[PDB]
């Protein structure tokens with residue numbers, strides 16, 4: 001899957017994310033692509049290739065698809081499916097869309113399907129949040145899995161020394177013991193559902209990062225967004241059981257989401 005750079009036309013810049021700048025391009029004249037320029041020093045060529053292999057081997061309609069790489073050059077390019085509506089957090093905050101509640105549940109279903117697939121491969125995300133989901137031209141939400149173990153947590157999200165975690169997306173056992181597991185991805189998925197139904201509000205907005213960490217241990221939970229029915233809130237709230245082993249799996253969550261979608 002090495003791509004000839006002569007088959008790529010760069011159109012314009014999209015922004016900067018994990019591992020570097022992203023541009024909108026065309027591949028072979030007819031395919032929309034995203035092209036990310038791997039920042040020098042973020043990973044070596046061999047480390048990049050190993051991260052790309054992980055991405056290629058994970059295949060699902062709701063995971064952003066790898067198309068190819070350009071490694072005979074610096075910087076390295078990675079070429080993926082183009083997500084024209086960009087990051088989910090920014091998309092939710094764009095009021096021009098006038099989201100219906102059915103559309104919001106469909107976004108949750110999209111991500112839940114991706115996460116059910118990753119769960120079936122025992123693959124952990126560890127930073128699931130609206131800022132790490134993408135939206136295509138059709139409004140479908142997908143997750144990029146590229147290099148997740150190498151993600152850098154920005155200062156906005158952390159409150160610790162040494163071991164870091166995204167405080168407002170983390171269950172009590174991560175906040176206290178840095179104990180990540182499938183069940184911490186479940187917790188974060190619930191927070192993502194809350195972000196979707198709140199149209200991109202920040203979780204726990206009245207508390208600092210350190211206060212949030214303390215208060216979660218002491219039972220703080222996110223309230224029901226106005227756009228979420230009680231049935232939808234039951235689903236996100238099930239992700240937040242104190243005891244990790246009492247939280248559902250992604251397969252159970254998907255079944256619950258489909259049930260509510262059918263009823264509502």
Ligand SMILES: *CCC(=O)N1CCC([C@@H]2CCNc3c(C(N)=O)c(-c4cc(OC)c(Br)c(OC)c4)nn32)CC1
Nearest residue numbers: 015016017022034035036078080082083086087144146
């Ligand atoms: C809200 C977060 C934010 O502001 N971001 C993150 C997303 C990027 C940018 C938006 C437009 N589309 C896009 C794509 C894409 N595939 O269309 C990517 C992207 C992401 C990754 O890994 C995270 C990789 Br690998 C890509 O390889 C080509 C492409 N990023 N965006 C703007 C800033």
